[PDB]
RNA sequence: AAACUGCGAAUGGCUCAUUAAAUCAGUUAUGGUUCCUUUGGUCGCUCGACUUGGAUAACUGUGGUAAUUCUAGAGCUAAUACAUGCCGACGGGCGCUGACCCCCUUCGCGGGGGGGAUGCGUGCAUUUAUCAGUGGUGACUCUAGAUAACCUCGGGCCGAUCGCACGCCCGGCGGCGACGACCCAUUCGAACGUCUGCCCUAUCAACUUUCGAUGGUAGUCGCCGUGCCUACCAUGGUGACCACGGGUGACGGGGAAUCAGGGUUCGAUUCCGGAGAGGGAGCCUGAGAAACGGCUACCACAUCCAAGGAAGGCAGCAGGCGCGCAAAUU
């Protein structure tokens, strides 16, 4: 049970640092857009 | 072995108190002449002194050594013990028995 | 018995209180521990909610730290020198904490001498003669050496403390309270504690 | 007195229990548990005076004792157990299954649901808390401490979980335009949407809540639980749906309701 | 200048005796929107009930006064004045209480009439369980 | 049945003596603490016996004292009592160490980058010091992370415990519980603090202070915050906005009686909070007591007595005496 959870938070955990990885690159996407602005 | 008795007031004796008259002592739970009744109780019970003189009602006497002659009250008189032993490894110990 | 209540003395105005309740248990005070240097004799005491509580009575070792180099050790504790709050817990040689405290060197003089391979300590003239740490300062590889050169490099230490070194005993800050947890941790002077420590010793001294 | 209380006056009972005042001395006082004494509704006054299964507290001890009583998915056999807020009381034997939903009167109500709705609970939490390597925690409003929750979970939005296994299915965020039952307070009972959050560093941030009839009405954040993200909920209602009709209304629908029936 | 006392004075956390070859001030924003002052952050003042660089903690209630006395050390009594509403006489009566408040000494320049506001905390001494978070100086008194 | 063990006996009940910023009420705080229980977490996270030890009680049997819910000596015998303690997971990771060894540049030294025998440690809790800045607050010297260690012999955890139905598998492996447990959270709380609010009195105007008065520094003690208590400094603190002292036929509040509007009076009394068990005081046990249907003294009063001693606490329910204008059934 300890093994299976923390491996299964892991790929979510992943996940959800994927996709706020994701809005890092979107910010410095905005601020790409800015400085071609 | 002297083990001790009782005063001619009916006090009993305590070991080691170190006197021959009777003193009063705070009496806890894991002491001689007193059970508590509440846990944690502890109460100033009367006790006479370890020292032995006349001034006493019995002496309390353990035969360690047996004599020469075969007492006629005591030793003639054979009683076996009156429960046999329950937890297994005591069993082993008495009946000296193996593991297997 | 002895308590720790707020109602047996004055208000602000000056005015004496009445009492309106008999001492309750938890307004507790328990005697002080006045703990001494002796062999370690530590009594548990039970406190509020079943929690133990260790007196130390007498206690001579402690897990005192060296905070330059991050490095600590159980080192003895040999004399109280200075206590800032009574100036008669040094006569009685009282730990508490925030007390000022001769300690052995020797742990930390051992690790300095194993870790950076230079002879500290040890005054001028003199050898080790069962060539033990001789050879602790010596005989090391090819890159290994280049690695304690790298650090011998920046490895000085501040005449105060290659002063008390020499002497064998450092000059440590009690920073556990030995009364409660019945330990007599700390840290060693250095820099301006040091310097502030050994001003307030030689004020006291004369 | 020198030390915990064991009994409750009847009289010194909450008033949402409905309890009479002549019958007896004393209140069931709830035993320690999830929920807290004055939010709570102890299983023998739910078994006995809300359904009435029972006449005195001996035959509740002798229902319960039978094992046939299941809050949120496990059997207790305790008449002063505290079964509060989104709990699912599953008695097996008369297959039934209530959720003790508030109803727009601050009691809990009777509100029977099907056996499929019985299997999961909305819980709203109380703090994120990091365990001893890592370990990202929650605390639950019925004292369930879930380890290695989603990350954008954060403290006043509920989490639905499955009773049968104590894990998360789904979670609300606690976002304005969510639906929002009230837990405490004047308006215990009221079921609204979020319209405003209202920050006060260090005193205690309050929140207004548009109803289903544009009845809009202020609450502390502490008593207020998201049931539904928009304007679905995530459970089953009561009916009333929380929307308070004003004591004029209540009156007005109480009297249509008897001449119209006869 | 500073450490007059036999022990030694410090901030507990800032660490003073890294190895070498200015010591560093620990601070913190107290909350409430209240600023930080300059001499809290620039000074070399060590007060462990400082609400900017001790170990004491603002929580509860935030009360306002006008200090009044300035003769203990490191602390101050301030005044506040209100107005109780006796029914009966249809009226207000003018009642004080004088609380003694701790004064960290990054506020250097106060002086009696200053209108002080103070946050609550854990009680510092037998009387105080209040610092002060900002001074605003007296009507006028430019000069 | 008894006896051991566990738990309860800290609630309930009674009374209002004390108590005038005390108690209590509304209001906050606990980022300043403790918490049996309950609920949910945790409970092969540590790298190092297919079940251990010997007492004791009931029991049996000898007793003593005038006397007690007094106990003594002897013969046995149980644990979820008191103790002691391993195997497993376990094969290896991670920090140092550091023999050995590999590859490149240089005439070579030198420079620069990888593998690596052995040994020392490593889990949570306790205690100290340091370094960096996963999640959270209005704000931590928070939570978590890393390093270095420490580990109270009056000794934190890591299960030598019990019951139901019992099966599958060439002796191993498993379901449903009960009990116990470090730590965290939750619950029930409790404690100490915040703001504001009390009757009469000036024939009480100055009081508090080197037997702490108000502060500061550092300790001790405490569950924690703090003159709580020490030591050393400072000379403060409160007051006509009534401090300080005195009185109260004063426990406080929700409330009660009267009352047009205001008010006045009462609230010992069933709910909440407080306090006390004849007067003070001290402590045991426990999560919780300064417990009195617990213990130990003293003072007061009083009971059995073979005169040596033993026992006491109805402001619990009945009831008796006394007191009274004044109040019920052993």
């Known amino acids: 049970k300890n ?13 959800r640092m994927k996709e706020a990885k994701e809005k890092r690159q979107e910010q410095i996407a905005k601020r790409r857009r800015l400085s071609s602005l | 072995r002297i083990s001790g008795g009782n005063d001619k007031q009916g006090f009993p004796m305590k070991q080691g108190v170190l006197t021959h008259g009777r003193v009063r002592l705070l009496l806890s739970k894991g002491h001689s002449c007193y059970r508590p009744r509440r846990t944690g109780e502890r109460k100033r019970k009367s006790v006479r002194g370890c020292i032995v003189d006349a001034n006493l009602s019995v002496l309390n006497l353990v035969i360690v050594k047996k004599g020469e002659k075969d007492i006629p009250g005591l030793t003639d008189t054979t009683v076996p013990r009156r429960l046999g032993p329950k937890r297994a490894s005591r069993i082993r110990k008495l009946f000296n028995l193996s593991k297997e | 018995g002895i308590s720790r209540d707020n109602w047996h003395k004055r208000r602000k105005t000056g005015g004496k209180r009445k009492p309106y309740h008999k001492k309750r248990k938890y307004e507790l005070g328990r005697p002080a521990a006045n703990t001494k240097i002796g062999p370690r004799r530590i009594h548990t005491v039970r406190v509020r909610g079943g929690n133990k509580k260790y007196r130390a009575l007498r206690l ?19 004399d ?24 052995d060197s020797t742990p930390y003089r051992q690790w300095y001498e194993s870790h950076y391979a230079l002879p500290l300590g040890r005054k001028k003239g003199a050898k080790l003669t069962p060539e033990e740490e001789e050879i602790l300062n010596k005989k090391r590889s090819k890159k290994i050496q280049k690695k304690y050169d790298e650090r011998k490099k920046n490895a000085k230490i501040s005449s105060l403390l290659e002063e008390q070194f020499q002497q064998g005993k450092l000059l440590a800050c009690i920073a556990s309270r030995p009364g409660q947890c019945g330990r007599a941790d700390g840290y060693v002077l250095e820099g301006k504690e040091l310097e502030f420590y050994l001003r307030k010793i030689k004020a006291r001294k004369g | 007195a020198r030390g915990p209380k064991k009994h409750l006056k009847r009289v010194a009972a909450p008033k949402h229990w409905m309890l009479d005042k002549l019958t007896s001395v004393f209140a069931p006082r709830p035993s320690t548990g999830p929920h807290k004494l004055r939010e709570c509704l102890p299983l023998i006054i ?16 002798k229902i319960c004792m039978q094992r046939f009583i299941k809050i949120d998915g496990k059997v207790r ?3 002063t157990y505290p079964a509060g807020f989104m709990d699912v009381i599953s008695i097996d034997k008369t297959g039934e299954n209530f959720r003790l939903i508030y109803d727009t009167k601050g009691r809990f109500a009777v509100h029977r649901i099907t056996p499929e709705e019985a299997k999961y609970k909305l819980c709203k939490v109380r703090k994120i808390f990091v365990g001893t390597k890592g370990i990202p925690h929650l605390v639950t409003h019925d004292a369930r401490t879930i380890r290695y929750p989603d990350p954008l979970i954060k403290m006043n939005d509920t989490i639905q979980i499955d009773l049968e296994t104590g894990k998360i299915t789904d979670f609300i965020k606690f976002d304005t335009g969510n639906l929002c039952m009230v837990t405490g307070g004047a308006n215990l009972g009221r079921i609204g949407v ?7 560093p260090g005193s205690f941030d309050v929140v207004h809540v548009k109803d289903a009839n544009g009845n809009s009405f202020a609450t502390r954040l502490s008593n207020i639980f998201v049931i539904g993200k928009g304007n679905k909920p995530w459970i089953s209602l009561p009916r009333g749906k929380g929307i308070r009709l004003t004591i004029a209304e209540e009156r007005d629908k109480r009297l249509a309701a008897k001449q119209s029936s006869g | 200048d500073i450490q007059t006392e036999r022990a030694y004075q410090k901030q507990p ?5 890294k190895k070498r070859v200015k010591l560093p001030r620990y601070y913190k924003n107290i909350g409430l929107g209240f600023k930080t002052p300059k001499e809290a952050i620039e000074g070399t003042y060590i007060d462990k009930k400082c609400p900017f660089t001790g170990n004491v903690s603002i929580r509860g209630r935030i009360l306002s006064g006008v200090v009044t006395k300035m003769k203990m050390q490191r602390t101050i009594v301030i005044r506040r004045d209100y107005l109780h509403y ?20 990054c506020f250097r320049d106060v002086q009696i009439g200053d209108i002080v506001t103070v946050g609550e905390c854990r009680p510092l001494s037998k009387t105080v369980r209040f610092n002060v978070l900002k001074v605003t100086k007296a009507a006028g008194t430019k000069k």
């Open chain 3, 80 to 103: 109280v020198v200075y206590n800032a709050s009574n100036n008669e817990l040094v006569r009685t040689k009282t730990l508490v904490k925030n007390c000022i405290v001769l300690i």
């Open chain 4, 194 to 200: 979020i319209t405003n959050r209202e920050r006060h």
């Open chain 4, 77 to 79: 056999a305790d008449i």
């Open chain 4, 46 to 61: 739910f078994l006995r005076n809300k359904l009435k299964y029972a006449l005195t507290g001996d035959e509740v001890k």
């Open chain 5, 86 to 105: 006796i029914r009966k006489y249809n009226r207000f009566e003018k009642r004080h209480k004088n609380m003694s408040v701790h004064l960290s000494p």
């Open chain 5, 13 to 17: 956390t800032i660490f003073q005796n």
């Open chain 1, 3 to 15: 093994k299976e959870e923390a491996a299964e938070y892991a790929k979510l955990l992943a996940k």
């Open chain 3, 60 to 78: 001579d070792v402690g897990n005192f730290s060296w905070g330059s180099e991050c490095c600590t050790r159980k080192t003895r504790i040999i």
